Design a protein around this ligand. Sequence first.
Ligand SMILES: O=S(=O)(O)CCS
Ligand SMILES: O=S(=O)(O)CCS
Length: 291
Amino acid sequence: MNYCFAGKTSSISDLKEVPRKNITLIRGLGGEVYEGQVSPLQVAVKTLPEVCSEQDELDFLMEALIISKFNHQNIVRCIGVSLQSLPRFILLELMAGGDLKSFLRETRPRPSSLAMLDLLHVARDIACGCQYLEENHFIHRDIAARNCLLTCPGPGRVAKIGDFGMARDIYRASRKGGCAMLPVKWMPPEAFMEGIFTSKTDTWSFGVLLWEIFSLGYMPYPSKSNQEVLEFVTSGGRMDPPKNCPGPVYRIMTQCWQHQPEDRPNFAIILERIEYCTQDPDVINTALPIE
Ligand SMILES: O=S(=O)(O)CCS
Ligand SMILES: O=S(=O)(O)CCS
């Protein structure tokens, strides 16, 4: 089983095998993910339940190959693997801030020290990750708050793309899925109607991620079902600004949601616009709404 990224092919053997005796599990984090320890390296441990098929297993191995090939500060690092023992482990950078959706929901003023500039820095981090993917011709297909993770909860947090399950499914023709499992609320019309995916479909998903960030972890199209969203969006319908969202930030969203992919910005342009936003005192002095 082979995988190519950045003009270089790899196989299972290129993965760094960490001896099982070197690995200790410390707690469940919510297959399963554990906080673990290599010795001392603090790690996250993703496990493959032994009750899965040989196909699920190859899926798991492809996921490991994909993540190990990236080299970017805004994509979660793969520390190595433990594949010569059952259950199989993948070892990842421990992300102590947990997922972005949970973080937003948990740290929203109800008062807190989270501010507009902090949200924009998270958006910038993920857009930087996305630009690296785009430049390297990799289509994520599943950009969303639940798939982003934070290094820590506090002021110096860095956000990173931390799940590549959907991209992996395509490299393995995974079928094993179905309609009810497709992240419909994050997908542009050409993706959900035609099964067409490009870097401009990640641009669309990024705009919905922005809405997630600035609404502080609300579900997109909060009062609509998947099918209602499909009908809404195909008819030109777009989400309203999140509560208190500055106009320059909402404008990035609406640009990401242009009906034709060719009219949507690439990630370099998205990054320029996020930066403009962090430079505007009227943007970053805006207060977050209280729960
Ligand atoms: O779909 S999964 O590989 O995560 C579970 C199979 S046991
Ligand atoms: O300009 S930044 O260093 O903040 C992001 C590079 S993608």
